[PDB]
Design a protein around this ligand. Structure first.
Ligand SMILES: c1cnc2c(c1)ccc1cccnc12
Length: 330
């Protein structure tokens, strides 16, 4: 079997991407944030605290004839950005672009933190990191990818995020028309539950390539590219007027600037992020100071190859016996 679904940026900045997901019987379509940095499929629901729902589409398990309460199961997650959500669990039919999983754990939110409520475009998350990070207690649950894997034509999923445009998430196959050149595969460590790999270095604009090992995670659920301070300082040193701002909480730069590109290494291959991908607009409405798309990972503890990096490439999340990551230009 295969699945194919269009992913769409939630706003003019590509702050996040939403993909329609069918849940239950009859189908209840919710737009979820496919996140390769977490392993919980959670949704806004009829059980979510009323004051914490503001515009989101909710899943109502009582209206689904295939929904079954997972007795005694609860979930509670806290994300790297300080957001959090928790609630109870149901098992139900979940479909992504033609691909169907019966008995998938659908985590129904009872409580969500402010950032989730404030984002009316995101109805929940669909985790695609390793099932070892799933928060369901006392019985840990599997991800949608893990549940579909045995049924897929090939045990893979691909991320093809667009820059200010729609993209695609494919399950079970590699679309050879969606990229240029060839796909370079690289080693993955699953020890932290993430799609964690090692980049072979970087370049800033037309600059000379620096061979240096950068350990980080391929994370579709993170907007920006978080890299070591030395690397991020080398990047922003090429932008006239760019500075690290403690009040804004990152590198900011004149909105009038034209940004240089950023290249990252995948083995002997190179993914080039065009400069326009690194512009995240005014720091506050009407400001002439813009927020950068390349930020330091010093406060995080892990480097994150978020959407800024991933959207410049066709990305293969290979769930074979030994998982690997494939990257190709497009
Ligand atoms: C991810 C994280 N932080 C941001 C954005 C995206 C976009 C704009 C912005 C403006 C000021 C401060 N942070 C951000």
């Amino acid at each position: 079997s295969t699945g194919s679904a269009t992913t769409t940026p939630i706003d003019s900045l590509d702050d996040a991407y939403i993909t329609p997901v069918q849940i239950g019987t009859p189908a209840q379509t919710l737009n979820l944030d496919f996140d390769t940095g977490s392993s919980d499929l959670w949704v806004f629901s009829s059980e979510t605290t009323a004051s914490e729902v503001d515009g989101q589409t909710i899943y109502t398990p009582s209206k689904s004839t295939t929904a079954k309460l997972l007795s005694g199961a609860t979930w509670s997650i806290s994300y790297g950005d300080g957001s959090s959500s928790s609630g109870d669990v149901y098992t139900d039919t979940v479909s992504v672009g033609g691909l169907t999983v019966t008995g998938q754990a659908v985590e129904s939110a009872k409580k969500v933190s402010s950032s989730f409520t404030e984002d009316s475009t995101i109805d929940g998350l669909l985790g695609l990191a390793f099932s070892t990070l799933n928060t369901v207690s006392p019985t840990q649950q599997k991800t949608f990818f893990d549940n579909a894997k045995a049924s897929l034509d090939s045990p893979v999923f691909t991320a093809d995020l667009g820059y200010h445009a729609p993209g695609t998430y494919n399950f079970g196959f590699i679309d050879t028309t969606a990229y240029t050149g060839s796909i370079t595969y690289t080693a993955v460590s699953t020890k932290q539950g993430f799609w964690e790999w090692t980049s072979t270095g970087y370049a800033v604009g037309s600059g000379t390539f620096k061979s240096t090992s950068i350990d980080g995670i391929a994370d579709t659920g993170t907007t920006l590219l978080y890299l070591p301070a030395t690397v991020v300082s080398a990047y922003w040193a090429q932008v006239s007027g760019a500075k690290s701002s403690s009040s804004v909480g990152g590198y900011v730069f004149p909105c009038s600037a034209t940004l240089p590109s950023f290249t990252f290494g995948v083995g002997s291959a190179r993914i080039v992020i065009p400069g326009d991908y690194i512009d995240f607009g005014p720091i506050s409405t009407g400001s002439s100071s813009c927020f950068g798309g390349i930020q330091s990972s010093a406060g995080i503890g892990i480097n994150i190859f978020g959407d800024v990096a991933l959207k410049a490439a066709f990305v293969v999340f290979n769930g074979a016996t030994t998982p690997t990551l494939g990257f190709a230009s497009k």
